Design an enzyme around this catalytic site. Structure first.
Site, PDB file in Angstrom:
ATOM      1  CG  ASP A   6      45.097  19.108  62.804  1.00 43.55           C
ATOM      2  OD1 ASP A   6      46.169  19.342  63.408  1.00 43.55           O
ATOM      3  OD2 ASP A   6      44.761  19.725  61.777  1.00 43.55           O
ATOM      4  CG  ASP A  11      45.844  22.381  65.655  1.00 39.42           C
ATOM      5  OD1 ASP A  11      46.828  21.791  66.143  1.00 39.42           O
ATOM      6  OD2 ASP A  11      45.637  22.460  64.432  1.00 39.42           O
ATOM      7  CD  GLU A  56      48.673  18.691  66.055  1.00 40.61           C
ATOM      8  OE1 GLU A  56      48.684  19.819  65.516  1.00 40.61           O
ATOM      9  OE2 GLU A  56      49.629  17.907  65.943  1.00 40.61           O
ATOM     10  CG  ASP A  60      49.515  24.040  64.195  1.00 39.99           C
ATOM     11  OD1 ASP A  60      50.602  24.425  64.671  1.00 39.99           O
ATOM     12  OD2 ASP A  60      49.196  22.840  64.105  1.00 39.99           O
ATOM     13  NE  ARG A  80      56.423  21.272  65.055  1.00 36.48           N
ATOM     14  CZ  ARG A  80      55.544  20.455  64.473  1.00 36.48           C
ATOM     15  NH1 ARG A  80      54.283  20.838  64.272  1.00 36.48           N
ATOM     16  NH2 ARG A  80      55.937  19.264  64.047  1.00 36.48           N
TER      17      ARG A  80
HETATM   18 CA   LIG Z   1      47.682  21.065  63.913  1.00 32.84          CA
END
Ligand SMILES: [Ca+2]
EC number: 4.2.2.2
Length: 352
Positions: free
Chosen positions: A129, A131, A166, A170, A218
């Protein structure tokens, strides 16, 4: 001025009694925030003790350049990031011109956070993760004028074959109001979630004046809620664009789409399709798909594409104040306002 041009209404740390601090490194930012939780007696104050405006002057180009030269070596490394957890006094992190970071900013259960003029790229730890920006359970967050980049590429053998890098931004949980504006996002496979699962639905998010280039998907992957996307420049989208799911509603207005596959769709669930109101984009009818190289594909499961390019639903009255320029003006002018080193300049009709 708490005006962000979107759902988030926050001035961040730029309020009364704000303490200005200079961070020359990632660790400095960590130490500054930690010190900002103490009162005059040295006791901790829940939410923070005073407002903060942090100017980040560090430069990690070395780390970024080495990572760019070896992208497949990033995913397995430890993720690097500054966490802003339970800090509600108001905080602004602004990068100095010429500064850069090979670490992310993770916001958790905070509110009134502004991140500006940060050039973040090629983060390590995509499999854990890593990010660039994460907004979790955090209302009133403004992510503005940043450059978020990596390589739009998936290395072989990464976990879930989707963890080379990543996401750029988010958003998940109770981050009820968020504004993502004037960012230059390029070379990113998974740009950003708007809900972490089918159950994590809701939120009101605005994406405006962003410049997307060479991104796979996304933009965002929306799960319920409302999303207002205006004045963005979407170019070279290699997978899919705005994916409206779990009955989410989107107002897609005055955007410029070009060389994009599935720019507006609702796929991967096979049910509970979201809706969109389309208006003022460079694309006005299916005839324009060829003109701007817009391609469409199917999915193995039931899906809905905007190939008819018509509105499939409704959208509540936009609460905030805003005024978009034309789609043509974003195409012409946006690249000069989006990103870092633009002195936080905004695109106004005057400049069109
Ligand atoms: Ca993420």
């Amino acid at each position: 001025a708490t005006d962000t041009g979107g759902y988030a209404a926050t001035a961040g740390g730029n309020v009364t009694g704000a303490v200005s601090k200079t961070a020359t490194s990632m660790q400095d930012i960590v130490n500054i925030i930690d010190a900002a939780r103490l009162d005059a007696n040295g006791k901790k104050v829940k939410g923070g003790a005073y407002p903060l405006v942090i100017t980040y002057t560090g430069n990690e180009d070395s780390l970024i350049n080495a990572a760019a030269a070896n992208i497949c070596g990033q995913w397995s490394k430890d993720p690097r990031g500054v966490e802003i957890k339970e800090f509600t006094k108001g905080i602004t992190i602004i990068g100095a011109n010429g500064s850069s970071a090979n670490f992310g900013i993770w916001i958790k259960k905070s509110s009134d956070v502004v991140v500006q003029n940060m050039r973040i790229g090629y983060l390590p730890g995509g499999a854990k993760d890593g990010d660039m920006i994460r907004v979790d359970d955090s209302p009133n967050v403004w992510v503005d004028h940043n450059e978020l980049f990596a390589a739009n590429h998936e290395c072989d053998g990464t976990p879930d074959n989707d963890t080379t890098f990543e996401s750029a931004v988010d958003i998940k949980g109770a981050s009820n109001t968020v504004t993502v504006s004037y960012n230059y996002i390029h070379g990113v496979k998974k740009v950003g979630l708007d809900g972490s699962s089918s159950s994590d639905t809701g939120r009101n998010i605005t994406y405006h004046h962003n410049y997307y280039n060479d991104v796979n998907a996304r933009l965002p992957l929306q799960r319920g809620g409302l999303v207002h996307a205006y004045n963005n420049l979407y170019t070279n989208i290699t997978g899919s664009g705005l994916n409206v799911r779990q009955n989410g509603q989107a107002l897609i207005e005055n955007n410029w789409f070009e060389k994009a596959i599935n720019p507006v769709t609702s796929r991967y669930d096979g049910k509970n399709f979201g809706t969109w109101v389309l208006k003022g984009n460079n694309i006005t009818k299916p005839a324009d798909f060829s003109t701007y190289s817009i391609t469409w594909t199917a999915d193995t499961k039931p899906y809905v594409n905007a190939d008819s390019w018509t509105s499939t639903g409704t959208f509540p009255t936009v609460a905030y104040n805003y005024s978009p320029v034309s789609a043509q003006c974003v195409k012409d002018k946006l690249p000069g306002y989006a990103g870092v080193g633009k002195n936080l300049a905004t695109l106004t009709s005057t400049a069109c």
